[PDB]
Structure formats: structure tokens, C-alpha cells
A paper describes a structure:
Ribonucleotide reductase (RNR) is a key enzyme in all domains of life, utilizing radical chemistry for the synthesis of deoxyribonucleotides by substitution of the 2′ OH-group of a ribose 5′phosphate with a hydrogen. R2c proteins generate a MnIV/FeIII cofactor and the recently discovered class R2d—a MnIV/MnIII cofactor. These dimetal centers reside in a ferritin-like scaffold, and are coordinated by two histidine residues and four carboxylate ligands.
Interestingly, the distorted part of the αE (residue stretch 159–168), adopting a π/310-helical conformation in all L61G structures, has an increased B-factor for the Cα atoms, suggesting that the mutation has a destabilizing effect in this region. Overall, in all structures reported in this study, the first 288 residues could be traced in the electron density, leaving the last 34 C-terminal residues disordered.
Author numbering:
A (entry chain B), B (entry chain A): 1 to 275, 279 to 288
Write the structure that this text describes.
């Protein structure tokens, strides 16, 4: 039974991604958020509610990626070096999820925080899309999986970390781009910095497994991937309308979602399927 | 579907163990090993061979813990804060496994390293020990598991990290306690510092599950736990004889194994079943 041996490369990219993930390591204790209170209070009730809701949805995303996605993808990988990288990525997803609670602690009372997480747990659209994603992971709860099943779980992973998250990243970035909630915005930028390389790395692994499939299996998962993309897209447009109508940002967020959908497709080596907001861009600075 | 909420504790210990794991974070680049060459060359061939073999055995252990044990235990947990800690621990197991390659890089040529890893992969006792432990993990590759199955996977985990590893930790510690290979010994001490709190944490989780089992189930897993303990012990006594007879350390290591078996049992809230070498103690200093 094989032990991991980093003195003999199993691929051409796991070492560089390992090094980069470690280089980018951070924890929430490093960013004090209390100074955000001064711009928090300038927001309206509806703006504050949108902010808490999208952070709640992001926390659900990281909870599923660290606790289900990365574990079940990595456990079936034969590349032990790539396995190491995914394990580190899953731990950093839990750092991300914890960093959202660090923001909440400064911005909300204990009762308001419990409102958030109860709204997350009972929200029908969050349940629907998190459930579509994790169904691909739960398919891996067996001793032997097919490469079709492992590939599609990787697709699901890229679509969550490169694509579905950005309906939520939009608003912290938009506010930070206007000088509001900028310390929380630095936390979100750290998270995004990790998520970007997570999506690139899983996409590379996916392309490698795709190339190992029979022609029939490739045709099947190419079609499934495009169906999944648009199933999630349809759900995400209902999500953005529910979250952002109150604050007049529905169509701006949708443009951001399509932009990042294109990046997730490219992370998978696939062509774009849709045609950055300058305030958001300023929040990424 | 629930997101992790750290502003409402799910238990009385996950936050403390989260903070400590993070506080203890390290990676191999922090410890240069080149200065160990000056005591490496003073060891005999038999001593150099034992050292390479036990580090190879240790790497296999961490490879299976980070890539199988932690993912398959954590994924079935209902406690999302505990899930977070385990994901971080599995990541640190991969840091540990990689640190062993960093030592090898200073001490062995590229060809000698590949010999090590081939000896690990084909070695019958290592295959047997890892095979027994991971069989408890692979039982968790299904959608629904029993608490007996999850409990015995946690037992397997404690027995590996608190107990089976120490037939290997003995020798780097014994040499470091004498001023030999002290930089590698510092790496081994950081690994042990992580492993100790790993076994404690998983042991706490096992005791929580144990208290939920029916009395009949409790007695069944107590019997399995005692049998597994002694089955592994019998294999380790053959392993120490194989590794350490050439260098006269067999009975010293056996005593170290019994000492750490007792610690693993205690991590599980169980009574000791066996009755530290002072140089090993100085290597831990």
C-alpha cells in the first residue's frame, strides 16, 4: 500500500498548488472587523438583511465543500499528491466558514445570528442548489465509483466554488468597492483568493479524468455538465431576484453570475456559454 | 440544510481544539535539515536502514489518515464544528507526510528514496496493519452507517495516531535524544505535538458516540476494541523484531509501544492494558 512520495512527481501541478495553498494560509483572527460598525450602521435594514443572507448562503457552501465535497472527491483519487492538496483545500473551506461567523459576531446580536442560520437551514432555494451539488458527492459514498461519477462530482465542485458562490460574493465586494464594510471585504478577498485556485485545481483534475473516459462516457458527461450548468443558472436567477430585488441589484448580480459561470467552464477546459461591474472591481482591489 | 454556526456551540470542546490546531500550524520549510548530514554519516548502515524504514512506515500512516481516515470519519458526523476540526487535522496529516519527504531529500539520494517507497508498498506487515485500520474506514463508504461502525472507525483512528505510529516515532526520538539527527527530530516533535491532540480529540468524539449506543452495542464494540488492540499489538511485535533486531532495540521499542497503547486506550476513556525510555524522553525535550 502506497505512501505519498513527493520526491517523485505524480503530475506536473500538485506541487505548485500545494505550495501556493500553504503560502496563502490565513485565519480569521488576523482581520479585526470591529471598525466595520461605523459603515454597517449607514446601511439600510434591507441592505443589512441582504448582506447577512448572502453570507449565510456562502457559509452553507463552505460547510458542504469542506465537510462533504473535498472529502469524498479526494478519498477516491489515486494521485496521492493531488489528494494532499484537496485535503488542505477542504480545511481552508472550514477556515472560510468560520471567518463568516467572525464577521457575524461584530455585526449582529446572538439572536440575529440564530435568525440567519435558521433562515439558511429552511430556505427552499438554498436547499435545492446545495442539494443538487451534494447529490453528486453522495454518489461517491461507495467502495468503487466510476470515473463518470468522480468527474461529475468534480464538475459540481468547480461550479460551486467558481460559479454559484459569486451570487453571494457580489454584495460584500460591491459594498467594499464603495468604502463600506471594508474589513469584512478583506476577509472576503482572502476567501476568493483561495476559491480561485481551488476551482482551477479541481478543474485540472477533472480534465485529466475526462481524458481517461470512453467516448460514450465523455459524450454523457459533456451533456450532463451543460445541463447542470443551466439548471443551476435557472435556480440562481430565482435566488438573486429573491435576495436583491429589495435593493435594486438583481440584474447587476446576474451579470456577475454569468461572468463567473464562464470562468468555471474555462476552469473545466470548456468554452464560455454567456456573454465586471466597476464597483465590484474596486472591491477586489 | 445547516451551515456551521460558531456563535452557538455544538459541544464543549471543538472550539478549543480548533484554536489549538490552528495555533500549532507549521510546514516543513520552517526547518532546514541539511545540518543533520554531519550526524547521519556517523550512523552505521544498519542504523541508517532502520531510520529510513520507520520514516517510510510513518509516511504511510499519515497518507492513510489524511486521505482516508479523517475524510470518512468526518463526513458522517452531525456536529459541524467537530467536522471542521477533523478536516483541519486531516490536512495536517498531509503536512506531516510531506515533511517526511523533506527529511528524505537531505538524507537519501533519489534512488535510495525510491527504494524506501517500494519497500513500504510491498511490505507484508505494513500492508497488514494499514489494511486492518483502513478496513474500518472503508466500511463508511455508504450513505448510512451505524454508530458501531463510526465508533470503531474512530477507535481505529486513535489506535493509529496514539499507538501504532510510536513503533516508528521511537527511533528519531532516540537518536535526537543523543544529539543525532536533531533537526529531523524537531520535525518529528512537531508531528507528535499534532498527533497527540488528534488522538485526544477523536477519543472524545468516540466516547460521545459510545454513550449513545445500546448496552448490547457498547459491549460488542468494547470486545472489538480489545481484540483490535491485541491484534495490532501482535503485528507490531513482529514489526519491531524485523526493524530493530539488527540494532539491538527490540525490547526498548516494545516497551514504548505498550506505553502508547495505554495512552490510546486512555484517550478512549478505557483502562490501560499493559504495565518511557530516558533517551527518548530527552529527544522529546
Amino acid at each position: 500500500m502506497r505512501a505519498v512520495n513527493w520526491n517523485k512527481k505524480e503530475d506536473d501541478f500538485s506541487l505548485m498548488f500545494w505550495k501556493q495553498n500553504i503560502a496563502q494560509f490565513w485565519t480569521e483572527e488576523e482581520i479585526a472587523v470591529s471598525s466595520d460598525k461605523n459603515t454597517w450602521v449607514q446601511l439600510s435594514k434591507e441592505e443589512q438583511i441582504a448582506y447577512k443572507r448572502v453570507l449565510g448562503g456562502l457559509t452553507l457552501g463552505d460547510t458542504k465543500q469542506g465537510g462533504e465535497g473535498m472529502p469524498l472527491v479526494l478519498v477516491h483519487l489515486e494521485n496521492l499528491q493531488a489528494k494532499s492538496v484537496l485535503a488542505f483545500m477542504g480545511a481552508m473551506e472550514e477556515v472560510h466558514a468560520k471567518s463568516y461567523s467572525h464577521i457575524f459576531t461584530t455585526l449582529a446580536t446572538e439572536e440575529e445570528i440564530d435568525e440567519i442560520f435558521d433562515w439558511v437551514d429552511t430556505h427552499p432555494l438554498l436547499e435545492k442548489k446545495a442539494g443538487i451539488i451534494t447529490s453528486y458527492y453522495r454518489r461517491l459514498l461507495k467502495p468503487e465509483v466510476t470515473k463518470k461519477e468522480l468527474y461529475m462530482a468534480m464538475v459540481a465542485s468547480v461550479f460551486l466554488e467558481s460559479y454559484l458562490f459569486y451570487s453571494g460574493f457580489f454584495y460584500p465586494l460591491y459594498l467594499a468597492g464603495q468604502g463600506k464594510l471594508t474589513a469584512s471585504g478583506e476577509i472576503i478577498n482572502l476567501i476568493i483568493r483561495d476559491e480561485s485556485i481551488h476551482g482551477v485545481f479541481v478543474g485540472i483534475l477533472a480534465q485529466q479524468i475526462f481524458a481517461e473516459l470512453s467516448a460514450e462516457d465523455q459524450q454523457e458527461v459533456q451533456k450532463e455538465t451543460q445541463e447542470l450548468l443551466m439548471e443551476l443558472y435557472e435556480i440562481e436567477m430565482a435566488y438573486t431576484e429573491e435576495i436583491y430585488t429589495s435593493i435594486g441589484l438583481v440584474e447587476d448580480v446576474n451579470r456577475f453570475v454569468r461572468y463567473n459561470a464562464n470562468k468555471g467552464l474555462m476552469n473545466l477546459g470548456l468554452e464560455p456559454k454567456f456573454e465586471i461591474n466597476p464597483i465590484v472591481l474596486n472591491g477586489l482591489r
